[PDB]
Structures are given as structure tokens and as C-alpha cells.
Write a protein that binds this ligand. Sequence first.
Ligand SMILES: C=CC1=C(C)/C(=C/c2[nH]c(/C=C3N=C(/C=C4\NC(=O)C(C)=C4C=C)C(C)=C\3CCC(=O)O)c(CCC(=O)O)c2C)NC1=O
Ligand SMILES: *[C@@H]1O[C@H](CO)[C@@H](O[C@@H]2O[C@H](CO)[C@@H](O)[C@H](O)[C@H]2NC(C)=O)[C@H](O)[C@H]1NC(C)=O
Ligand SMILES: *[C@@H]1O[C@H](CO)[C@@H](O[C@@H]2O[C@H](CO)[C@@H](O)[C@H](O)[C@H]2NC(C)=O)[C@H](O)[C@H]1NC(C)=O
Ligand SMILES: *[C@@H]1O[C@H](CO)[C@@H](O[C@@H]2O[C@H](CO)[C@@H](O)[C@H](O)[C@H]2NC(C)=O)[C@H](O)[C@H]1NC(C)=O
Ligand SMILES: *[C@@H]1O[C@H](CO)[C@@H](O)[C@H](O)[C@H]1NC(C)=O
Ligand SMILES: *[C@@H]1O[C@H](CO)[C@@H](O)[C@H](O)[C@H]1NC(C)=O
Ligand SMILES: *[C@@H]1O[C@H](CO)[C@@H](O)[C@H](O)[C@H]1NC(C)=O
Ligand SMILES: *[C@@H]1O[C@H](CO)[C@@H](O)[C@H](O)[C@H]1NC(C)=O
Ligand SMILES: *[C@@H]1O[C@H](CO)[C@@H](O)[C@H](O)[C@H]1NC(C)=O
Lengths: 30, 50, 105, 446, 99, 50
Amino acid sequence: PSKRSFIEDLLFNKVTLDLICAQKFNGLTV
Amino acid sequence: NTLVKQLSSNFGAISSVLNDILSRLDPPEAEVQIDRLITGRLQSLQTYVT
Amino acid sequence: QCVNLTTRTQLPPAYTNSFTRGVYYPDKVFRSSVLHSTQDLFLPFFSNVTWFHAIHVSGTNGTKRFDNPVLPFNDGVYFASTEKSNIIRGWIFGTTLDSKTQSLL
Amino acid sequence: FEYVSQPFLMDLEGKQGNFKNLREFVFKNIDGYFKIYSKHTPINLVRDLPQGFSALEPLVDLPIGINITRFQTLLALHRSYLTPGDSSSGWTAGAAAYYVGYLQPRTFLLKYNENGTITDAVDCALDPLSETKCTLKSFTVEKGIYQTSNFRVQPTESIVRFPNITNLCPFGEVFNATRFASVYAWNRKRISNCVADYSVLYNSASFSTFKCYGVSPTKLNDLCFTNVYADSFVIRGDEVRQIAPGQTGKIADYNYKLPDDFTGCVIAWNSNNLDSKVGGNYNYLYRLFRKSNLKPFERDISTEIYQAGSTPCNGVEGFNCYFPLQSYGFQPTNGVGYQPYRVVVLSFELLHAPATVCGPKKSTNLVKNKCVNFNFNGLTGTGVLTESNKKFLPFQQFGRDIADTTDAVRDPQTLEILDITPCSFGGVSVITPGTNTSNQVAVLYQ
Amino acid sequence: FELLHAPATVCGPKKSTNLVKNKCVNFNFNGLTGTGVLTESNKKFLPFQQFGRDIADTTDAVRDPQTLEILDITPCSFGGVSVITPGTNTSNQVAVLYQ
Amino acid sequence: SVLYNSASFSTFKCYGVSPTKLNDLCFTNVYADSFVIRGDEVRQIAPGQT
Ligand SMILES: C=CC1=C(C)/C(=C/c2[nH]c(/C=C3N=C(/C=C4\NC(=O)C(C)=C4C=C)C(C)=C\3CCC(=O)O)c(CCC(=O)O)c2C)NC1=O
Ligand SMILES: *[C@@H]1O[C@H](CO)[C@@H](O[C@@H]2O[C@H](CO)[C@@H](O)[C@H](O)[C@H]2NC(C)=O)[C@H](O)[C@H]1NC(C)=O
Ligand SMILES: *[C@@H]1O[C@H](CO)[C@@H](O[C@@H]2O[C@H](CO)[C@@H](O)[C@H](O)[C@H]2NC(C)=O)[C@H](O)[C@H]1NC(C)=O
Ligand SMILES: *[C@@H]1O[C@H](CO)[C@@H](O[C@@H]2O[C@H](CO)[C@@H](O)[C@H](O)[C@H]2NC(C)=O)[C@H](O)[C@H]1NC(C)=O
Ligand SMILES: *[C@@H]1O[C@H](CO)[C@@H](O)[C@H](O)[C@H]1NC(C)=O
Ligand SMILES: *[C@@H]1O[C@H](CO)[C@@H](O)[C@H](O)[C@H]1NC(C)=O
Ligand SMILES: *[C@@H]1O[C@H](CO)[C@@H](O)[C@H](O)[C@H]1NC(C)=O
Ligand SMILES: *[C@@H]1O[C@H](CO)[C@@H](O)[C@H](O)[C@H]1NC(C)=O
Ligand SMILES: *[C@@H]1O[C@H](CO)[C@@H](O)[C@H](O)[C@H]1NC(C)=O
């Protein structure tokens, strides 16, 4: 469904982007 | 993570929770404590911005 | 001296939009060609403001109005008058409106 | 107060046609000053107000200093041969209309011309365009997206939860006892399993010295403590002035030393009709000499011959040998600084165990799934309460997060675990094609 | 006590001195002190207006309490000083530049 | 040390130095003053007081 080549998939699986919620509760948004 | 951790600091005041200070102190003695907390958090925010 | 006027006719109040009226100088400091942001007691823009008119409608049993009812003061009053024959003359401010408390006149 | 201006003679003829005079007034009552602003303008209209903008200049600021809560206008009617009847019915009123509006605290952006006359203003809360203009400090905005303000869901209710305790602990015994102990051998008393009653204790017996550190005396009825302590002694007047942390004094003051950060306070009152004897009262005893200072909250009962001099007394009570304990001399007829005062010290501590001693707040019902105010044994805040899946061990009260903020709590009554999640909040963005083209905007909540 | 709300009405016996303008001097207008040149002003004050201030929240126009005259305030001329030198090695002559 | 408590003094409290530490410091040309004042005047024998 996501039109990305095989090498792009391998590149996406090797990067690793609740911790987020606690930040969100103090006026911090992404 | 460091910016969020900086909220858990006394900065010289009696307590690090603002609601706690407001709950058990009259305004004339609460203002100085609140001012200490405000200046500490202001510095903690300016460092992150820089 | 007190006399209770009679022959008043019943009339429901009518309302009118306030448009942009009600701006005053908030301080006595001169300023030129600048924009100033200040918070104070101001009349909001585009608000219902109560409207009264005392007129004797011609005809049999015509609407005869003498509208001087007691009104609350709250935190300030914007009082506007449209005049041609100098009818509205003055105001009375008070709390109990008798000898028990002082009343500005 | 009375003022009469210069005499004049106004026209009194009833004018026909259309209205032509507009008179605007603003009345304010601030800090005892009745401020009046006025403006007069020729117009031509049969009803409503003109759309043109006009400013109001101050006229008078009368200093009366009284209430004004209600007001009424006065109208001048007309009587002539065309109005038969008595004073109540024989009258007519000319056409006249007036408008009443109520003020409220608002923030305005005013524009001053070259001469300093206010020619335009913007109300910062009328609509998103006005609020964006106030944010940018300009009367015109170009195209783009702007961050203007924030929002937060307001609370809908308040809940108070206190432990199920009914018995009122007696403060009397530590306050109306027939006798107390000496200064050096000061007594201690523990208080637990109580509903506090600091309210009546503040002013019941017309106390002399009442002053508190780390807590407000009027706020003592809003806080929950654990193991409230009580001290007791009787001492001269002057030392009462240095019964306080971070203060020095005599050796009797070093006997009972308060910590640097002490929560609580001291309560002192007069004692001359029970501690004064016609023959003199000397039962009470105090210390006068010691080797060094003492740690805070420490008691001493040691009685040994003071040996400051370079001679071993060995319990001889000879020259340069002094007994450290001396007896107070109290008589009904002495100086104003010579009447004993009875002193009791209350000390407090927070966040150490489940609460056991605090005042009489009627616990309210528990409402969940809607973010409201709350009070869990002094733990206040706002947020949605809901059921929790995290298992608490029996000895655990509540849990906290990395931000050192409470996110789970235990209900004091039914011993139930609840989560805390503050109301939804965010910024607001305004999408506008520019004031130059159109006055339509779109609003985006992030 | 209260300050900066209306024209002054209660204060002590200071013998008012003569008015000197066009030279930057000290001044004292009803407790408003400072230094500067006083000169005639063209900005029209409404009858209820006392003095004028600026963006920096410092007074720039004032009304003379006695004769009700409008005066401007301008601080004395100031600037930096720069020294131009060819080095101590060569000569001990310098030039001075006021910016 | 002996002067601190020998004669049971009435008013004794020191500025810029702790009395218990007065035995640990070395000075030069120690001055002494002398006068008599009533009870009220004693309370304002202190720096920064009128
Ligand atoms: C209440 C009804 C009311 C009446 C009948 C009234 C009449 C009135 N006011 C005038 C001027 C004026 N009237 C006032 C002030 C006042 N005048 C007052 O009756 C009061 C109570 C004040 C003060 C708060 C002032 C300041 C002017 C001069 C306006 C100007 O020339 O700028 C004048 C002469 C100039 C003209 O025709 O405009 C009349 C006939 N004004 C009113 O406000
Ligand atoms: C005008 O009307 C008012 C209200 O109807 C009258 O005030 C009343 O007077 C009677 C008789 O003295 C009292 O019993 C009432 O208690 C009064 N009411 C109020 C609200 O005060 C007033 O007397 C009338 N004035 C006249 C007829 O001249
Ligand atoms: C200003 O306030 C009045 C009073 O609340 C509003 O009049 C009400 O209008 C609604 C809807 O037509 C009626 O159900 C009420 O009965 C009215 N009030 C009264 C006292 O009769 C009026 O609508 C408001 N102004 C505007 C512009 O909406
Ligand atoms: C105005 O005077 C009264 C006291 O005489 C006060 O306001 C009253 O307050 C009570 C309750 O506190 C109300 O029941 C009354 O209705 C109030 N008076 C009026 C006329 O409404 C108050 O002390 C004074 N106002 C201010 C601002 O101090
Ligand atoms: C401002 O004042 C000047 C004179 O000082 C006058 O000519 C002018 O009409 C006034 N109004 C405007 C809008 O300039
Ligand atoms: C207090 O009351 C609650 C509810 O009425 C009840 O569940 C509880 O058992 C009572 N006792 C204690 C000690 O909480
Ligand atoms: C001590 O007992 C007496 C006798 O009832 C009482 O009047 C007094 O209030 C008590 N003291 C307290 C409660 O501190
Ligand atoms: C935009 O504003 C400028 C002056 O503010 C005006 O000259 C221009 O015509 C405006 N744009 C349009 C499309 O009218
Ligand atoms: C500058 O100093 C150096 C080293 O002292 C010297 O050799 C040189 O001659 C000097 N310059 C002049 C112009 O004399």
C-alpha cells in the first residue's frame, strides 16, 4: 500500500523514532 | 526529557509543587516562593530555546 | 411633594444593537500615532442594550409611556440619550433610595 | 458634598420634527471615585444609534466614596391647557428615548491619531479576526496561518474526599491541664485518629501569642496531617520572643531548639492567677549552663555539676562550681517581664503516611469520567478520574510519574484506585486570506 | 498616599525658581525629575491632559504647573569616543572621533 | 567565651558574625563604645534603623 521500494523499507525499519504523553501534559506538543 | 525533568526541582522554595504552595500559604508569603519557582523555570526554558 | 403619576400604558421593552459605541480615554497621558493595548471596563461591541422611549401616541387609548424604572448599576453604566426638546434631565444613584443611606443626585 | 454651577437659561420649548442631539455618558464607581465621561454630538435620526465611531473624554471625578448599586433617570413632563386632569393624570411627555448598557472588563486595542484622538479600537474577544489583530498588534493582517491563543476544558464539578473518621480528638488536656512540666524536662504528646478543630481553638480563649510558620492560620482547616505533636512548658515573657526557628537565646532556649525548617507554630498565653503564690512559687526549674549547643527537638534530663573552670569539682559545689539548674522566682507583684507564660508547640509533617488528623469537611459524592476539581487528603488539581488497571501493593498509597506529578491515587473511603488525566487542551490557529481581500477566517484546533 | 493620578494638590514648601529653556538642565515638575533641554511644543494637549510619554515609558512632554504651558524634554547630546592611533611603536600621536 | 554568659546579659546578638564563632577569628584594633540609653532606644541600636 505504501509505494516505497525495498531499500526504502529496509532504511525505514532500521530507525526507531508513556514517555510521549507525560511530555504532552506539560504544554509540549509535536 | 531533561526539560520535563527540570519541573521536579525546588530552586530554593519550600516545595516544588505549585498547588501545594498555594494550598497552605497566604498570598503575602506565597508570592516570594512562587517568584523563585518562576525564575527557575524561566531559566530552564531559556536554556532549551538557546 | 410626592405625586404618583397615572394613565401609564403597558409596553414590553424593545432592544437595539449597540454597534461600536462606548470608547473612552482610559488615562490622562498623551500619546501620538501609536497603538496601545489596555484592559479596562469597556462596553462590548455588538451587544443588546436596553431601550426606553417616553412618547404619547396619538389616538384613542394611545400608548402613553413615562419610562423611569429602577435599574441595576453593576460595575458601570453607559447611558445614551437622543433628545430634541430636552426631556431627560438628571440621574439618581443609590442603594436603598431613601433616608437610610446616602444617594447621589 | 454640594456644587452649583453658573446660572443659565435653557430653551424649554417642545421642538417638533426629528431628534438632533445625542448625549453619551459613562458612569464608573472605582475606589470611592465617581468618574463621569461625557460626549455630545449633533445627529439626525428617528431611532437607534448612529454607526459612527466617537470617543468619550473625562469630565469630572467626584470623590464621594459610597456604594452605588441602583439608579434611575428623571424626565421632565409638560403641562398646559391640552392636558386636563389632576397632577397624577393631567400631564404629557414629549418624545425622548434613552439607551442603557452594562460594562464588563475587556481588553481593547486603541489607535491614537497624530493629535492623540482615539479614532478606532478593536475588541480582542469579538471574533477570531479581532483576536488575531490584537495578537499581532496591527489593524490589518496579511494572508497566512497564525498561532493566536490556547484553550482548555473548564471543570464542571468539585469533589472532596476525606477518611471516614468521626471522633473529635480532645485538644483540651494539653491546654487545660492542672499542671505541666519544667522547661528542660518539656513534655511531649502525640495526636492521631482525629478530626481537627483548629477553627474554634483560634479565638475561643482570647489567646495572647498566636503566629504560625509554614502554614496560614486561616488555612489550617483545609490540610490533612499525620501524628500531630504537642509540646508544653512555662517560661518568662522575654524568651517567648525567641521561641522561633533560626533564633538564639539563653541556655533555656538551647534546651528546646527548633529545626531550621519547622512546620507548625507556637501558642502562648498568660498565667498569673494560677502560677503566682503569695509566698512565692519555685517548683519550676530551668537550665543555666551546658557544655555546648543541642540538636533540634532534643530533651535533656542530665544533672551534673558544671565544670567550665579548670578545677575538677567532683560534686563539691565549691568556688567556680555551679549547679546548672536554677529555680525561677515568680511572685504576684513583679515586673511586666516577670509573669510566666504557658506555651504549647504544634508541629506538622506532610506526605509520609495515610492521613489521620484533619478538619471537618463533609465528604462529597464521587463523580468520574468528567474532568473536575478534586481533593484527596490535600492533593488538589483537575483531571478526568477513571478506573485503573495498575496493581497497588497493600502498603502503597499513590503513584507518580517522571514529571513528579500525581497520576494515580487511592480513594480514602472505599480503598479504590483511580487514574488522573487532565482535560484536553491545545492551541488555536487562524487561517485568513488577509484583511485586504475578505473578512472570512477558518479555525484549526491542533 | 497615592501617586500619578491627577494634578498635584498637596506637597511641601519648595520656593519655585525661574524657568530656563533651550539649555539642558535639571528639572522638577511636581516630583517628575530628570535632565534635558526644555523647549516649546507643537503637540496639542486636550484640557484634561497632563503630560505625554513614549514607547520607552519615559516622559517626553510636560505641562508647566504655573502658566499651563507645554514643554518638550530632550536629554543632552551624547555618544561614544574613538581613538585612532598608529601604534606605540611608531609615534605617540592620536586622533579623537566623536560619533 | 566567658564574657558571653558570665554576667547574665540582657541584650546580646551580633551582626555579620556568629557569637559562637567569635573565638575562631582574628581581628585588629578592636573598638569599644560606652553610653546609657533607655529601654526604647535599645531596640533601634542597629544598622539601617532610624
Ligand atoms: C441630562 C440631560 C442633558 C441636558 C438637558 C443637556 C443640555 C445641554 N447641555 C449643553 C452643553 C453641555 N452640557 C454639559 C454637561 C452636562 N449637562 C448636563 O445636563 C449635565 C448633568 C452635565 C454634566 C455631567 C457640557 C460639558 C456641555 C458642553 C459641551 C461642549 O460644548 O463640548 C447644552 C448647550 C449646548 C448644546 O445645545 O449642545 C445643552 C442645551 N445636556 C445633558 O446632558
Ligand atoms: C405612591 O405609590 C407608592 C407605592 O404604591 C406608595 O407607597 C406606599 O404607601 C403606603 C401608604 O403609606 C404604604 O402602606 C406602602 O408600604 C408604600 N409602599 C412602598 C413600596 O413604599 C406611596 O405612598 C404613593 N404616594 C402617594 C400616593 O402620594
Ligand atoms: C438581549 O437580551 C434579551 C434578554 O435576554 C434577549 O431577548 C430574549 O430573546 C429570546 C429569543 O428571542 C427570548 O426567548 C427571550 O424571552 C428574550 N428576553 C426577554 C427578557 O424577553 C435579546 O435577544 C438579546 N439580544 C440579542 C441581539 O439577542
Ligand atoms: C454596600 O453596602 C452594603 C452594606 O450596607 C454592602 O453590600 C451589601 O451586601 C449584602 C451582603 O453582603 C447584600 O445582602 C446587600 O444587598 C448589599 N447591598 C446592596 C445595596 O446591594 C457592602 O458593604 C457595600 N458595598 C461595597 C462594594 O462595599
Ligand atoms: C490635528 O491637528 C491639526 C493642527 O494641529 C489640525 O489641522 C487637524 O485638522 C487635526 N486633525 C487631524 C485629523 O489631523
Ligand atoms: C466509612 O464509610 C464508608 C462509606 O459509608 C464505608 O465504606 C466505610 O467502611 C466506613 N468506615 C471506614 C473506616 O472507612
Ligand atoms: C478545659 O476544660 C474546661 C472545663 O470544661 C473548658 O471550659 C475548657 O475549654 C477546656 N480547655 C480546652 C478545651 O482547651
Ligand atoms: C492591498 O492593500 C493595498 C494597500 O494597503 C492596496 O493598494 C491594494 O489595492 C490592496 N489589494 C487589493 C487586491 O485591492
Ligand atoms: C616596531 O618594533 C619592532 C620590534 O621592536 C622594530 O624592529 C621596528 O623597527 C618597530 N617599528 C618602527 C617603525 O620602528
